[PDB]
Assembly symmetry: none
Homo-oligomer: 339 residues x 6
C-alpha cells in the first residue's frame, strides 16, 4: 500500500529523464538586448552573426473622424461588416444591427466575432471618440480590409481598402514584416518571435540592431546531468522503501534486471560506462559526476541512445516507463494485490 508512493515518485523522475531533447540540449548567449533566443533539441552549435533592420508590426486602422459619444448609432440601417485579412484567410462577416451601430456596439460586435482582430475606442480628448482596429498578429499578411454593406454612413466612417480612392479609416500603424540577416542570409518574417525560420531555434526580436552582433549556441549537458542525478536518487529512495510478498519481489527483481541487462545502439551499452555503478549487495546505483560529464562531453547523443533510445520500444527509461505504467494501471499487478 505505502509502496505505491515510492513507485510514483520514481515514475516522475523517470518520465523527466525520458526526454530526448535533454541529450541535444544547447544554451544561448546574445551580444545585445536587441534580440534573444531559446533553443529546443538538436540545435546546431556555433556563432551566428545577426543583423536586424526592421521589426514586424501589426496593422492598426483608426477612424479619420471622431464622434461626440459612444452610445449613439452611426447607421440608420442594419448592415454587415466584413473583415478580410490577407494570406489566403477566409473572410469573416459580422451582422451589425442599426441599434448596435454605436462605437460601443461596433466594438463589442467585432471583438465577440473572434475574427483575428481587436477593436477598441479611443477618447482623443474634448469628448471625442475614435474607433481603432488592430490585427491580433503582426505581419503584412495580417493587414486588413474592412467593408460594410447596408449603410453608406457606416461604410464611409469605418471602411478600409488599400486600393480604394477614399477610406474612412486611416493607417495609424503600417503592417510590416521583420527583416533580418542570419549569417549573411536574408530572412523575412511575419513575427518578432521567429521559430519557423531557423531550425530548432526560437529567435526573439526586441529592437533594430546596430553594428556587428552575434547569437551563440553552445552544447549544454547540465540539464541532462540534473535529470540523471534526480533519477538515480529517486531509484535509491525506492530501494530504501523496499528495504523498509511476491508483488514487491517481482517489481524489485525486474527493475534490478532492467538496469543490469541493457541494450543500446550507441558505444555506451551499460550504466557504468557513463559513470553510474551498481553496488552488488543492495542494488542501489552510485553516480560518479566526473565520469558522467566526460561521457556527455564526448558523445552526449550516444549517452542519450542508452538512457532514452527510440522512446517507443528501446531505451532504459522507455522500458522502465512501460513497466511502471503497467504496474500502476487499473489492471496491473499492484491493483490486484490491493483487491
Amino acid at each position: 500500500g505505502t509502496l505505491k508512493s515510492a513507485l510514483t515518485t520514481f515514475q516522475t523522475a523517470n518520465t523527466a529523464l525520458s526526454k530526448a531533447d535533454l541529450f541535444s540540449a544547447t544554451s544561448t548567449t546574445s551580444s545585445t538586448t536587441a534580440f534573444s533566443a531559446t533553443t529546443a533539441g538538436n540545435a546546431i552549435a556555433g556563432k551566428y552573426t545577426i543583423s536586424v533592420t526592421h521589426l514586424a508590426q501589426a496593422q492598426t486602422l483608426t477612424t479619420r473622424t471622431t464622434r461626440d459619444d459612444t452610445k449613439t448609432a452611426i447607421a440608420t440601417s442594419d448592415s454587415k461588416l466584413t473583415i478580410q485579412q490577407g494570406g489566403d484567410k477566409d473572410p469573416i462577416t459580422i451582422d451589425i444591427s442599426a441599434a448596435n451601430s454605436s462605437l460601443s456596439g461596433i466594438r463589442d460586435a467585432i471583438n465577440n466575432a473572434k475574427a483575428g482582430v481587436s477593436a477598441s475606442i479611443i477618447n482623443v480628448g474634448n469628448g471625442e471618440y475614435r474607433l481603432s482596429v488592430t490585427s491580433n498578429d503582426t505581419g503584412l499578411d495580417n493587414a486588413m480590409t474592412l467593408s460594410v454593406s447596408g449603410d453608406d454612413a457606416l461604410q464611409s466612417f469605418m471602411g478600409y481598402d488599400a486600393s480604394a480612392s477614399s477610406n474612412g479609416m486611416e493607417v495609424s500603424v503600417a503592417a510590416q514584416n521583420a527583416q533580418l540577416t542570419v549569417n549573411n542570409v536574408a530572412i523575412e518574417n511575419s513575427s518578432n518571435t521567429i521559430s519557423d525560420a531557423l531550425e530548432n531555434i526560437t529567435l526573439n526580436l526586441n529592437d533594430v540592431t546596430t553594428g556587428n552582433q552575434t547569437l551563440t549556441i553552445t552544447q549544454d549537458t547540465s540539464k541532462a546531468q540534473t535529470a540523471i542525478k534526480d533519477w538515480v536518487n529517486a531509484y535509491n529512495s525506492l530501494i530504501d522503501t523496499f528495504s523498509s510478498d511476491s508483488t514487491l519481489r517481482t517489481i524489485q527483481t525486474q527493475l534490478k534486471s532492467m538496469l543490469s541487462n541493457t541494450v543500446s545502439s550507441s558505444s555506451y551499452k551499460t550504466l557504468a560506462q557513463i559513470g553510474i555503478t551498481t553496488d552488488p549487495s543492495d542494488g542501489k546505483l552510485e553516480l560518479d559526476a566526473d565520469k558522467l560529464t566526460a561521457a556527455l562531453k564526448k558523445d552526449a547523443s550516444g549517452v542519450g541512445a542508452l538512457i532514452v533510445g527510440d522512446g517507443k520500444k528501446t531505451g532504459i527509461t522507455t522500458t522502465i516507463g512501460s513497466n511502471l505504467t503497467s504496474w500502476l494501471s487499473t489492471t496491473g499487478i499492484i491493483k490486484a494485490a490491493t483487491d
Copy 2:
C-alpha cells in the same frame, strides 16, 4: 456542537479562497513595462496586449493665479464692505459663490474663506520677502477646463486686487502658471487630456505621465497568468485543507448527515464539471483528483500551459458567466446557502 463551529470555519475559509478565484479579470490579467521613467502604466482586466509607441509633448498643468500687488500684512482687511467672491471653473461646472464679510477681508480671511468653501481650488498666502504678502489661488486639478474666473461684487478694492477674467482688459491677478492639457500620441494617435493620470483615453489602461518624452519610447502590455495561477493554487490548497477537516471530524461527527451532504456535493460539483470553453474538466487544465479522500493535486507546469494557450478558455471553466455557470459560481452559491441563517449548518448547531 464545537465540531459544527469548526466545520463552519473550514467552510468559510474555503469560501474566501473561492471568492478570490471567482474574478474574471484574473483570466485577462496583463502586466506592463515601460522604456522610460517618463511614463508608466497599470492595467485592469481585458487590456489589449502589444507594443504601444508613446510620445509625450506636454504635461497637464493646473492654473495658478497670483495677486499682482502685495500687502504689508495678513490681518488687515482689504475691503471696507461685505462682498461675494464667485469662483467659476470651466467645463460646464456650476459656479461657487462665497460670502466674504469686511472683517474677513484680510489675506488670512480670504484664504480660509476660499479653502473652507471646498470649491475645487486652493488658496494660499506667499511671503515674497520684505514683509510683503501675495495671495495665490490654484485649481485643485490640472487642465484647461479647470482654469478659473474670479470675480467679486460688493467692494471695488477687493475686485481690483483679486479678480481674474481672461477676457478682461485689466485684472488684479496674474497668471503664474497657465492651465494646460496633457498632450501625447499613442501609436500615432493624437490624444489630449485634462490629467497626467489618464485612465479614460485608452481602454482598461491607466497611463501615468511623469515627464515629456524624448526619442522613440514604448509601453508594452503582456499577458500575465501569474495572478490566475496563485488564485488557483490557493483554492486547491484551501479545499485540500477542508478535506482534512472532514477527515478529522469523520474518523466526532462520524456520519452527521450534514457533513456528509456537504462533502458529497462538493466532490460531485468538481467531478461533474462542464464549460463553454474546450476545458470541460479540472483535469484538462492540470488538476487531478485523489480517488479515495477526494483531494485535488495541482500540476503547476500543466496549468501554466493551458493558461498560456487559452487563458480566457480556462476562465470559462472556473468562472463562467459568474451568475449561473462556472465552478466557483456554483460552489459559491452552495457555500452561501450552507452558511446562511436558513441553511443546514445553523440547522445542525441550533439543534444543539
Copy 3:
C-alpha cells in the same frame, strides 16, 4: 488595571493629533533643494528655481598681527556690534589687557551677540581676526565700532557708509532668491519656513534647468496610529477579562463612548470607517482596506470623527479627558 489604562492612554494620545489627518510627503527632482511639510500643506507640483543662496556676512581685518597675545589697544574701550533689521545693539567692554586678538575673540564670543569671532593664521606668523554673522541674510550684516581707543577702532571697525574701514568684507551678506511657481521670493535664510505655508524648504545649491518639488497626500501615518489604538484598546479589554464597581464603570463608559459617537463630518460612527464593535466582548475589529478607502476619500473627515476640535469634541478627545480623570490623584 493601571498598566492596562496607561498603556492605552499613550496610544490614545498618539492618535489625538490633527496633523495625522492632513499629512503629506515630498519629493524633489534635485539635490539642489529638499522640503519637509507639516500639517495642511497643499498637494501639487511646485516648479522651483533657485538663483542665489543666502550668505552670512564675514568681515576680516585688513591688516595682520605678529601674535595673538599682545594688546592692540592701550586704553579700555567698548566694542558695539549692531546688526540690521530693527535689532538692538550689543556693547561689549574690552579692557586694554584683553585687547589682544585672543581677548577680542573671547570677548565677542562670550557676549552671545549673534556673531562669531575667530582668528585666522594666514601664514608666516601672521594673524587676522574674522567676524561672521551667525545667521545668513542682508538684515544680519554688521556694523562694528569701538570707542575708547583709536588704534582698535582703526584695526577692527566696520561701517559700510564709512570712508575708511579697518575691516574688509570677505563674504558679502546676501539673501536667498528663488521662484516657486513663477512667484519671485526673497529670503534671509536657506531654511525657508516662513514663505510658503506649512512647508519648510531647504536650499542646498543654485538650480539649473526646470526643477520641481512635489507634495503628495500621505495616510499611512494615520493608519498606523489607528491600528495601534485599536490594538491597545483590545489589550485593555483582555486585562478587564483577566481581572468590581470601579472596573465596571471604566469598562462600561469606554464601551458607551465608542458606541455613542458624535461628529461634524460625514463619518458619524466607527463602522463607517471600518472599525466594527464586537457585541460579545466590546472588542474592535479592524478592516485595513475599508479604512484606507475612507481616508483616501476624505482624510480630514475621518479626522473630524477621531480628533474633532481637540478640546471638547472627538473620540480621542473625550476618551483622553476620561482617562486623565480616572488616573488623576482625585
Copy 4:
C-alpha cells in the same frame, strides 16, 4: 579487532588519497594567467613559461557556410528525378565522403537528413527565408580554411546545379555565405595562423581562447602559482597527522591493536621514510622546505611562510623532493608504493584481517 583493523585501513586510505593528490608534478610548474582584454583569455597546464606575452589578433577563425543561391516552394518535393551521389570533400588531406541520395529522398528534407546522418564533418539545415521559400545551408562543423568544402553531385544535373560548390568552378549552385577563415594572431611578434579560436597546439602548455579582434597593445601574463602546491602540501601534512592520531587511539588501553606488529611496522616505516628523505635537488629534507617533525609522536608541523619562500625560490626543486621521478624516487612516490603494498590483497593488513 576486525574493526580495529578496519579503522586502520580507513585511516591509511584517507592518507593515501592526500598523498596521491600531492604526487602530481604539475603542482610545481603551476601557473596562473591574466589578460588585459576580454578579446582573449588563456589557461595553462603544467610547465608553461612565465612572462608577459604581447598578443595581437587580426582575424578570428570562421567555419565555411554554403547556401543555395536559389530557393524552393517547399521541403517535401524532390529536386532530382534520378538517384544520385553527393560527395563532400573537405580540405587538408581528409578523405572524401560519398552519400547516396535516392530520387524520392531528393527533397530539402531528404538531402538534409542524408547529409546529417552521414556524419561527414558538416551540418545541413533548411532556412525559411520568408514568403514560403526555403534554402538549404551547409556548414563545416569546425572552423578554418582547411575545413572548407567542395560539394558535387553525380547522377542528376538538376541537383548538381542546385547544390554543388567548387571554388574553382565557373558557375556554382551554392553561394559562400560565410567564408572559411583561419585565426590570425601574433604572439610576441611571431605570426601564427590557426584553424581554431581555441588554440592549444601553437604555444606550448598554453590554451589560448580567442573571443574578438584586438585593438592596440594587449598582453597575456603567465605567472608562477605556488598556491596549488601549498594546499596539496597542507592537506598531506594534515592527513598524516590524523593518521598518527588514529595510531595513538588504536594502541593506548579503540585500543585493541596495542602491541600489533602490523600497526608498529607501518608507523615505524612511515616515520623512517619522512626522516630519511633523499633528493636530486638542493632540497634534501622536509625541514629544508618548512616542515619539522615532533620527535616523540612524529606529527609534522608545517611553517607556511617558510614553505612559500622555498617554493618562490625554486618550486621545481621542492618538487624534486616531494615527487621526484614519480616511479622510483620522491617522498610521495615511495610512500605511495608502501601504502599500495600494505592495502593490497597480498599486503600486510589483509593477512592480519584474514588471520582474525
Copy 5:
C-alpha cells in the same frame, strides 16, 4: 557600578554639546572638526600643495662602501624657521654613502637620508626634510674635507652646489572664504580654529567645505547613559546599608528639540563646569569615591 561609570564618563565630555560634522564638495580636500567649530559654508580654493624639499647629489658613485673624504669632518644641517642647527661628526672611515646615510639618520635632525641606485652600478645620496614646507628646507655644509663639501653641500645662495634640488620645498597655498592662507603642511590644523583641514590635491572651480551642527553624537551619549542607569536599577532590584545608600543618592542627584534650540544649554546641565558642577560631574565624583580603595565598596 563600573559599567555605569563608563557610560557616565563617556557622557561627561563638553565637546559632545558643541559637536559638528563636515562635508566637502571634492576629493581635493576633506576636514575634521573638534569642539566649538563655527557652522557654515566655507568656500575653499587650493592653488598649491605643500612639498618637502629633497636634495640629491649631482654626481654618482661607483659603490656605497668607499670613503669620499680623506679627513674627519663635520656635517651641519640647518633648516629654516628659527630652528637651531644640528652638527654631525663624520669620520673619514664613515665617509661612505652608507656611513653618511646612517650618520644623518641616527642624528634625528629632522631630515632623512637615503641612497638611490640610479642604474649601471651608480649611486646617489638623497636627503629629504621630514616635514613639508618652505621653512623646513635645508642648508647642508661640511667643514673638514673639501671633497665631501664639494659632493654633498647645498646652500641656495651659493654659486656652485654639490647637491641639486630634486623636489622644491613649497608651502600649501589656499584661500578660505576669500582669505589667503599659506601653510607648511597639507594637514592644516593651526590656520582655522577647531578645524583640521586635509589637503589632497589642487582644486578647480568653486568648491566648498560645510560645517554643520551634530547633535547626533550627544543624543547617542545621552541614550547610552539612560540605558546604563536603567540597567543598574535592574541590578539593584535583582539584589545591606551600602546598596541602599548608593541607590538613594543616585536617585536624589538626578532629582532633539532641546538640543536643536540650545545645545550648549543642555550641555550646561549634563556636563557643567566639569570640575564641581553638572550631573555627570557629581555622579562621576560619587562613583569614583564608591569604587575607590577607601570607598563604601571596598569596605
Copy 6:
C-alpha cells in the same frame, strides 16, 4: 603527573610562538603604501622613508626573445647530422653555459629539452606557426639589456645556420622577436634605469612593481603603519595571560618558570626613552601577574616613537630586549637539557 608536565610544556610552546612573532624589529618600522595608478604599485619592508614620491615611467623592461627565421616540417627530425655544442652567453659578466647536443637529439624537441634542462637562465619553446610549420623560440628568463643572449653552435654548420644569434654577426639564423630593454623611470625627479620591472634594488627598503607606462603626474605614498606591531603585542599579551591560566589550573619546576617570567616583565630595561612596560600601556595585576593591555595608550606611544617602543620589546635581538631574554629562557626550558625535559625523567 605525566600528562600534567605535558600541559606545562603545551602552554609554554604556544606562548613561545607569540613571543617569536613579536620579536621582529620590522614590526616597529612598518609602513603601508598607496598608489595613484594601476600603472605601478609598491610594497615596503622595514625602515622605509615616509612621504609622497612622484613617479614617472617612460619605458618598461623587456626580456629578449630570439626566434628561428626559418621553419620546420616537424619536431622529431634531426637538424644536425653531427654531434655539436650549443653555447649560451648572456651579458653582464655572466659565465657562458655550454650544452652538448648529440645528432639524434638535434630535433626541435631535443634542442628544446636540452636547453631547458640545462637551467642556463633562458627558456626554449616550440611555436607551431601554422600549416604544419614549427619555429624554435628562446627567451631570457629575466628582463633587461644585460640578460640578452648570444647563441652559437660548434660542430654542425646546419644547426649553427638555423639557431645561432650574435648581434655583431653579418648573418644570423635567429631573429630578434622581442628586443631586450631596460625599465626607465624617475622617482622624485631622479632618473633611474633598471633591468627589471620588479625593482627592489633602486630605492631602499621598497619594492616597486612596474605594470605600465605612466601618463601625467602620479604618486606613490608611503605612510607609517603601527597596526602590525599592535597585533603582535595584543597576541603576545593574550598568549601570556593564557599561560598564567594554565599555571593556575596546575596549582589551584613550574614555580621557577612562573617566578622568572614575572620578574623578567617586571624588572624591565631599555636603550630607548621607554624603560617600563607600564610606560607603553601594558599594565600588570598585583594578584596573579596578568597583563592588561590598554590599546589607546599603546597606539599613542607607537605613534610618538615606534622605534623607541621597539627598543624595549625587541632590543638588539641578541642579548637585550624583553622578547629576546624571554625567548632565550623559553628555548632553554624547552630544550633537551632543560628544566622541562628533566622533571619528566
